[PDB]
Ligand binder design. Sequence first.
Ligand SMILES: CC(C)Cn1c(=O)n(C)c(=O)c2nc[nH]c21
Ligand SMILES: [Mg+2]
Ligand SMILES: [Zn+2]
Length: 317
Amino acid sequence: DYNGQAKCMLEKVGNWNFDIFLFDRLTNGNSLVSLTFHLFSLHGLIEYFHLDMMKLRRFLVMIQEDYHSQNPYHNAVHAADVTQAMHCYLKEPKLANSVTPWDILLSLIAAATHDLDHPGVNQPFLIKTNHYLATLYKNTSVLENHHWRSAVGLLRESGLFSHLPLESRQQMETQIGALILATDISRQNEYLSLFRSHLDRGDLCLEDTRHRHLVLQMALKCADICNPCRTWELSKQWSEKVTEEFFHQGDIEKKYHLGVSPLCDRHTESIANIQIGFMTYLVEPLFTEWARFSNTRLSQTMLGHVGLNKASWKGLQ
Ligand SMILES: CC(C)Cn1c(=O)n(C)c(=O)c2nc[nH]c21
Ligand SMILES: [Mg+2]
Ligand SMILES: [Zn+2]
């Protein structure tokens, strides 16, 4: 019954107003698997790459179950949301007319696995508490490298692409890594500045693989922080969840005298100001540049929502 209602929702998987929260409830927590499998079929990837559907479901389940459902924000639903957004971006004219099945395959896998096995705390926390991951990745994009190598592990274990040449599997791992690493927010200035420069010069050639993947990396960055670009009813829920996670880290830091990280103090930092600052300094700059690249109704709709939602938070003051 609810399963049948889930199928109908997927008919509008391309809508910016898709409700991932409802979709996950109807599928009993199977949103990432159900949505991603559907997108693989929709984009013809199963046929294009001669995929074994049994291995595909196993791979997707491995990913989904390796997310910590106990995290209020960084869980499989966030991953499914990012994947759904990435799908909407792949439908944008400039990408739709240039991406290959291989690019779509990598983009969706990257989106689905970009926060894999996230512990619910940030890089600075891992570094100051001497977590083994901080040592392993030399305090550099610690979380993102962890998500990437975790994804590589699942790719190899599932054998989903065992029929393709070794070189292809190795390239897949590298390109997915480039996509996942671009989601390290601490490096947004580097990616945004580069994207902005290319747009200023107007020299982006989408038939060039390197230029196209820079665009895909920017698309995934957009997908990762597009919560404020969704309609208020969805955006509001995302804001409460991410703040809940931040404040929980802050509670740990306070309890163990670790020093409270920025945006994590529930006693001195307002959820309203956290959201407003995030929208003003990180979201709007990125989506404004994205709008220059893809000057469509979707880009204007997303910017419109940030403006409204931003105003709503200021109003709640
Ligand atoms: C820290 C990182 C998850 C980026 N980030 C953030 O800083 N704020 C404030 C958000 O609301 C938010 N929502 C998604 N990502 C977010
Ligand atoms: Mg991340
Ligand atoms: Zn994310």
